[PDB]
Design a protein around this ligand. Structure first.
Ligand SMILES: [Zn+2]
Lengths: 204, 369, 126, 286, 54, 121, 240
RNA sequence: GAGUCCCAUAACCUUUGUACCCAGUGAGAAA
RNA sequence: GCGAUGAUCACCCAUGGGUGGGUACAAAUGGCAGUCUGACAAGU
RNA sequence: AUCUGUUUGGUGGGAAACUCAAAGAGUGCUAUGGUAUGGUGACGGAGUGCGCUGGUCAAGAGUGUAAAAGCUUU
């Protein structure tokens, strides 16, 4: 959208350049495709609607990132230790999954582990199969840092510390919105992730 | 003797110099027929002496049309006058191998000292250089030859058929298919705006039910106010100021956020009805008879659901889905509308007069009942 | 259209039947006789005893096909190009070729018998 | 493409000679880039000149056959065209010289009242004719003096002559005792070669355009190629289908040999049998 | 995978034993073992014609 | 080139109209523009006759594209009034179609008219 | 109409069979989400989430090449990386199917002479980028010799009596050696005075006279009366 | 230890509110 | 003062209502529908 | 069900590789001396003369004709 707002037309692209969009290596490709192309030439009365749509979706993404700013702000003002541990939008869809923050706080840590994967969980319980291990908590950055079966392992330890921090946030009264319990819990999860990424199943 | 060779191609013109003649009498034999497939032996026949590239796709299309209808263009004149030696016109002309027996006369009309050959020997020399292509040219052209071929084929075809992008019904297909999308987007977004402002006072969605009018008035009211003069765009405005006096519902950051949300709804609301005006105009220039008969938005949805103006045209009249006496006016309007769409598609730059006559006919039929 | 072979031509000249007129009063229809290049190769390979037969096969009324294979085995060529297409009458007097042709179905067979041509697997002759 | 540009029912008898021309008319201009010209004599006392529509240049865009009909009182037996100046010569009951403008012979150049069976013009020193008469005679004519020059009588009958295109006074005769004779025009008292390997009467001879070898078709149904300095056959070509090769030419490529037999067929051969006609990379050429 | 073959393993049996589903259909004699690469797909009848194949 | 291009001259027009009348008697003619396009997309049609003088012309020019798609001969008669009179109905028709039939007593005539209008086209 | 099929690869590369209780010849869709001539489609969900890719039913009563495929041709030369020169691209009916059989890495040059079919060809070649529409007469290949280079298969769905000359000219210009020549011969449109086997035999003889060795012919009888597909290869030296 | 990234951010059913219904044909229609 | 440029073709009352079967849209703290295990593991 | 007993369905060489060799097929790469650099002071460069190419004009000659014109001309 930003590039068609910038140039508009192919001969206009032949006379203009751009570096704030499309970084430094697709320029020769768009210029060669501007020189030779199977595309027609548009008029101004529909280039105007093309430009209106392009500025429309540019402003749409501006609204998207500022709504994400609002979500980050309300989340770190409502349950900030969960933000310090698992992150803003992950904790947000945890809370939005379980309904209330207190209804998520009074659930055990195993539930917070498997919280997104209910259909896989209950089919793997109603026939005697193996249950999932990730759920909605798979998209946390720590589980992203883990690799192998120990992302199941630190999904478990991350759900345990997230239950700790989450019910602290929901049940505290002298809470300070400063991330202290979430930060010490995150340090615990990070050095645990370190000590099980340091081991290796090879023999040296 | 086949001394020089002229290969036309989308990137420009090439003059090759024939080094070794191929066999004339043994030209149908197996080894002579597959030496033009082997590249290691074709390069013993043909050597590139010149390549004049084109100035762009405009001169490419000009020279494609001139080569197509068998005329020598100015770039051809330039490269042939550069490359071919000034032979005599009465004794031992220089021999140029072309692939077009009616381009030959245009070459001798300009250079009388050039006799042109396009028989089977020149044909398989030409298809040898076509078969190998980029390898003969030793790296001296800009642009990949097949990419220029795609561009030149599309340009040649649209020129030959007179493809106009004004009477291009894909614009109105995508315009109405996007307009329905933003109908439901403005609907759900202003529904959430009314929901988030429902706990500031839940009567603005009772007095002012239209989504755009609600959103634009709540973009500037954020409080009580009193001073109810510029809120009439005043019985509803007076009732609204009375309700603001009798406020009966419950921030700052959340209220700033729902102000940004209502500004988003207003931006969608005036990009719609810009798009609607655009597609009424595009429908008048693309389908004037259909839009005279049943209207611009209805004709837009008609050719969208049909898939194209051509598909709505070539459809039978008894199989048109337009949207007793009330049951058979649909059939009358259907076959008149199919007639109007046929007129409108296959006329090249249409008028409005037959849409007018069919509108007169269908109003006469409905007024008869 | 009728594919000729070499012993049919030899028996035509031995029985004094014209090719196109014998075909016409055999079938009571207009015939186009066809000499394949392998039948012509076989007549040329027959030597200088068969000069009369070769320059009666060289006749502008007898059209001629262009077979595309190696070797000059006319029985193989006639059998292949007739079982490919089924739009051909085969005029022959070889016993083996007559048995091949009358074993493949839908192919009429013409042959010099007596003092005129006869036709067998064509069910509309009168 | 091995296919005829045109056919022509030219005469009623045997067409006993034919050659090709660039007819120097002095009223019209010859269009040799789209028309080819062949003229041809027969035993029905006619020489006819024909034009052929030829697709070799694509310069132009047409009244093909029988542009004129020369007429003699007796039959003709051979014909050959001068390589300039609109002239040809026809042998028959007597040898006449003609040009393409006049409808009658310019000169009768006959030694005695004995008929002439064959004719060839020289290729360089183009004004020297040679002819074979049925009294076993080979006669040379000169067209400066407009007269015969010298004749020899051999044992048997010379069927054909061809001049050496690279030596201009040497010719080869092909005669009925089964061998060919390489003769010097300046001394006809001895052949300077005899090419011996045929077993029946030699019908036609021709030179390579390189002047280095000859081709020689005979009445035994076979043709033979001879190196010019040896005197025995370098190669023999035969076929069970080829009968009585009456005409042989050596194509101007010097690589193919055209033979006309008497079953009807005209066949191409390679002069060097083991030699293929593709272009060659330098490793295979070396 | 076998995890998806254990979900579409029944209608592949139906397609293998097509010939005895309707007493009037009478297919041509193939064997049709389960192909190594397949894909299960749903027919989109479009929004052009109604009521016939719908 | 006009829009209604492959028009027939007078002899071909009367040959066409005579076989149109005989097919209309033998129930082998579907007459009218949308019946013609119905039988054209169904594939039961041997050739389509459009009249080159109705009050719009694109109203039946929609049919040459269909005939081209399905390789059916199409021919332009210069009188809608004479075409309707040949069709045997009391109104002018602008397009008609000869449906295919092999129990048809005019198959040779239809094939001859098809050959004539296809060498025209 | 809303049923479920199983897609399975055919013997021919690039085309598929959808088995249900009636099985369908099916190709992948190069422009997903719309139908070109009203055929039905099949949408599979192949496994970032899985993506809905879709497939188009090839109708043998509206495509001579599909009638040939499902009558059984031993070798099509239309293959998933190739270049096909479609002659007589009468609309986008079969050219769309040839286009998405050939795939995104191959090119279909769709030659057509009429102009309203050409307009529909260009509007179809927008959403199928691997189609080069060429609006020109195929009887003069020099008029578009600049736009096309070195095709791998020619397909000929022209319906003219000078068919074999058109096929020979386009092959000698643009086809490569041992490339494919697929012909759809319509007997009644060549000539109707002789029978169908006579005109097929004459057309095959014309092809080998223009040195295209025929490998295979198929009558394609339940879908078209008196049609044929002749599949040959451009031998260029030595049909023997 | 342990099947989610393969739509529990989902699918289907039920209920409740809002807008409708219960194509082909091919020469008749009117008096 | 017609027409192929198309004629024609679910239950209850003395235009209007009553009763419901399908269509789409939206909603539901309506349903399916029930939130894994539990004490060892890694190293020297 | 210490009823039943039919049907359907199951039960009843391999692995590794930045290893070592032996071969086959296809594809890619200017893969280019039709007789190899401009030149062993025997050489090169400059200039002159001869040679060569093209168009123009003039003359000749043919052919044509009342005269022509035109056309042809190694
Ligand atoms: Zn043969």
């Amino acid at each position: 959208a930003r590039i068609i707002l910038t140039m508009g037309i192919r001969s206009k692209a032949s006379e203009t350049d751009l570096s704030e969009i499309l970084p430094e290596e697709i320029e020769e490709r768009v210029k060669t495709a501007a020189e030779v192309s199977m595309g027609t030439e548009i008029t101004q009365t529909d280039l105007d609607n093309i430009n209106a749509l392009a500025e429309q979706i540019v402003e749409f993404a501006a609204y998207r990132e500022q709504l994400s700013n609002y979500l980050s702000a309300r989340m770190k003002a409502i349950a900030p230790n969960l933000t310090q541990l698992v992150g803003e939008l992950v904790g947000a869809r945890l809370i939005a999954h379980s309904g209330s923050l207190i209804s998520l706080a009074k659930s055990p840590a195993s539930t917070i582990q498997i919280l997104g994967a209910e259909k896989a969980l209950f089919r793997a319980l109603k026939t005697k199969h193996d249950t999932p291990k990730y759920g909605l908590l798979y998209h946390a950055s720590l589980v992203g840092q883990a690799t192998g079966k120990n992302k199941g392992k630190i999904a478990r330890v991350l759900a345990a510390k997230a239950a700790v921090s989450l019910r602290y946030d929901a049940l505290a009264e002298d809470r300070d919105d400063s991330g202290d319990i979430g930060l010490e819990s995150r340090a615990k999860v990070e050095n645990r992730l370190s000590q099980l990424e340091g081991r290796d199943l090879r023999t040296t | 003797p086949i001394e020089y060779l002229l290969f036309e191609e989308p990137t420009g013109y090439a003059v090759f110099k024939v080094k070794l003649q191929q066999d004339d009498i043994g030209s149908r034999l197996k080894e002579v027929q597959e030496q033009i497939n082997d590249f290691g032996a074709f390069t013993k026949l043909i050597e590139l002496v010149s390549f004049a590239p084109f100035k762009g796709a405009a001169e490419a299309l000009e020279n494609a049309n001139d080569i197509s209808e068998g005329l020598v263009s100015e770039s051809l004149k330039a490269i042939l006058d550069l490359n071919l030696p000034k032979a005599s016109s009465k004794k031992k002309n220089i021999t140029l191998a072309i692939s077009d027996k009616n381009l030959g006369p245009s070459i001798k009309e300009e250079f009388p000292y050039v006799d042109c050959i396009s028989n089977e020997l020149a044909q398989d020399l030409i298809r040898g250089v076509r078969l190998h292509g980029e390898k003969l040219f030793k790296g001296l052209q800009s642009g990949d030859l097949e990419r220029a071929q795609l561009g030149l084929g599309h340009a040649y075809s649209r020129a030959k058929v007179k493809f106009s992008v004004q009477k291009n019904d894909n614009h109105i297909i995508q315009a109405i298919a996007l307009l329905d999308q933003l109908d439901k987007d403005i609907n759900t977004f202003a529904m959430r705006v009314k929901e988030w402002y429902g706990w500031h006072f839940p009567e603005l969605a009772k007095l002012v039910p239209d989504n755009y009018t609600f959103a634009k008035l709540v973009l500037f009211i954020k409080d009580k106010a009193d001073d109810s003069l510029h809120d009439l765009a005043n019985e509803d405005s007076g009732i609204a100021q009375r309700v603001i006096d009798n406020a009966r519902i419950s921030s700052e950051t959340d209220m700033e956020n729902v102000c940004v949300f209502a500004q988003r709804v207003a931006s969608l609301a005036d990009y719609r009805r810009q798009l609607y005006d655009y597609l009424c105009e595009k429908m008048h220039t693309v389908a004037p008879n259909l839009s005279e008969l049943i209207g611009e938005v209805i004709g837009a949805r008609l050719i969208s659901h049909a898939g194209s103006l051509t598909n709505l045209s070539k459809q039978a009249a008894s199989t048109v889905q337009i949207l007793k006496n009330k049951g058979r006016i649909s059939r009358y309007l259907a076959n008149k509308c199919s007639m109007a769409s046929r007129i409108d598609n296959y006329s090249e730059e249409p008028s409005n007069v037959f849409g007018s006559v069919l509108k007169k006919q269908v109003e006469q039929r409905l007024e008869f009942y | 259209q009728v594919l000729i072979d070499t012993n049919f031509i030899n028996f035509s000249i031995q029985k004094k039947v014209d090719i196109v007129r014998g075909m016409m009063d055999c079938l009571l229809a207009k015939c186009n006789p066809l000499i394949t290049d392998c039948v012509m190769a076989e007549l040329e390979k027959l030597g200088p005893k068969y000069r009369i037969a070769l320059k009666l096969a060289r006749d502008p009324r007898i059209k001629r096909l262009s077979c595309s294979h190696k070797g000059t085995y006319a029985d193989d060529c006639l059998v292949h190009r007739v079982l490919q297409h089924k739009c051909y009458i085969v005029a022959t007097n070889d016993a083996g070729l007559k048995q091949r042709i009358r074993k493949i179905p839908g192919i009429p067979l013409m042959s010099v018998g007596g003092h005129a041509y006869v036709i067998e697997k064509l069910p509309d002759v009168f | 493409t091995r296919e005829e540009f045109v056919s022509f029912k030219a005469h009623y008898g045997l067409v006993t000679g034919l050659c090709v021309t660039q007819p120097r008319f002095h009223d019209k201009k010859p269009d040799l880039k789209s028309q080819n010209f062949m003229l041809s004599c027969s035993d029905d006392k006619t020489v006819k000149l024909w034009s052929i529509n030829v697709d070799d240049y694509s310069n132009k865009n047409n009244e093909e056959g029988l542009i004129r009909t020369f007429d003699g009182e007796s039959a003709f037996q051979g014909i050959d065209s001068h390589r300039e100046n609109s002239t040809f010569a026809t042998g028959g009951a007597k040898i006449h010289l003609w040009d393409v403008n006049r409808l009658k012979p310019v000169s009768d150049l006959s030694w005695g009242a004995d008929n002439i069976t064959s004719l060839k013009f020289n290729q360089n020193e183009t004004d020297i004719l040679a002819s074979t008469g049925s009294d076993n005679s080979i006669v040379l004519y000169d067209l400066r003096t407009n007269s015969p020059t010298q004749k020899i009588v051999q044992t048997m009958r010379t069927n054909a002559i061809c001049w050496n295109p690279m030596e201009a006074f040497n010719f080869v005769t092909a005669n009925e005792d089964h061998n060919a004779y390489y003769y010097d025009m300046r001394n006809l008292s001895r052949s300077l070669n005899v090419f011996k390997d045929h077993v029946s009467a030699v019908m036609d001879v021709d030179f390579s355009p390189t002047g280095d070898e000859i081709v020689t078709g005979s009445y035994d149904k076979s043709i033979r190629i001879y190196k010019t300095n040896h005197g025995h056959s370098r190669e023999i070509y035969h076929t069970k289908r080829m009968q009585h090769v009456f005409q042989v030419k050596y194509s101007m490529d010097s690589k193919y040999i055209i033979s006309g037999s008497d079953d009807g067929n005209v066949r191409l051969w390679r002069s060097k049998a083991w030699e293929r006609s593709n272009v060659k990379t330098t490793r295979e050429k070396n | 995978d076998d995890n998806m073959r254990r979900e579409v393993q029944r209608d592949l049996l139906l397609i293998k034993h097509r010939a005895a589903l309707d007493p009037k259909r009478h297919y041509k004699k193939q064997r049709w073992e389960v192909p190594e690469r397949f894909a299960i797909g749903t027919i989109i009848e479009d929004k052009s014609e109604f009521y016939s194949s719908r | 080139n006009p829009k209604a291009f492959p028009l027939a001259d007078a002899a071909l027009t009367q040959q066409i109209l005579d076989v149109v009348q005989q097919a209309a008697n033998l129930r082998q003619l579907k007459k009218g523009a949308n019946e013609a396009t119905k039988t054209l997309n169904r594939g039961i049609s041997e050739f389509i006759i459009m009249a080159a003088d109705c009050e719009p012309i694109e109203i039946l020019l929609h049919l040459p594209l269909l005939c081209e798609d399905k390789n059916v001969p199409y021919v332009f008669v210069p009188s809608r009034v004479a075409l309707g009179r040949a069709c045997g109905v009391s109104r002018p028709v602008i397009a008609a179609s000869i449906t295919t039939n092999d129990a048809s007593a005019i198959k040779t005539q239809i094939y001859a008219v098809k050959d004539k209008i296809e060498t025209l086209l | 109409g809303g049923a479920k099929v199983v897609i399975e690869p055919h013997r021919h590369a690039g085309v598929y069979i959808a088995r249900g209780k009636e099985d369908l010849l099916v190709t992948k869709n190069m422009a997903p989400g719309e139908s070109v001539y009203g055929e039905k489609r099949i949408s599979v969900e192949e496994p970032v989430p899985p993506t809905k890719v879709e497939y188009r039913v090839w109708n043998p009563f509206r495509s001579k090449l599909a009638a040939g495929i499902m009558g059984g041709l031993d070798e099509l030369f239309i293959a998933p990386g190739k270049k096909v020169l479609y002659l007589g691209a009468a609309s986008g009916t079969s050219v769309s199917h040839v286009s998405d059989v050939v795939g995104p890495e191959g090119v279909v040059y769709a030659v057509e002479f009429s102009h309203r079919p050409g307009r529909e060809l260009i509007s179809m070649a927008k959403k199928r980028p691997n189609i080069i529409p060429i609006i020109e007469d195929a009887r003069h290949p020099q008029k578009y010799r600049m736009l096309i280079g070195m095709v791998d298969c020619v397909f000929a769905d022209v319906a003219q009596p000078d068919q074999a000359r058109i096929i020979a000219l386009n092959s000698h210009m643009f086809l490569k050696d041992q490339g494919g020549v697929v012909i759809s011969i319509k007997a009644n449109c060549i000539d109707s005075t002789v029978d169908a086997e006579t005109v097929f035999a004459r057309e095959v003889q014309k092809l080998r006279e223009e040195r295209i060795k025929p490998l295979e012919q198929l009558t394609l009888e339940p879908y078209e009366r008196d049609h044929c597909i002749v599949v040959g290869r451009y031998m260029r030296s030595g049909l023997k």
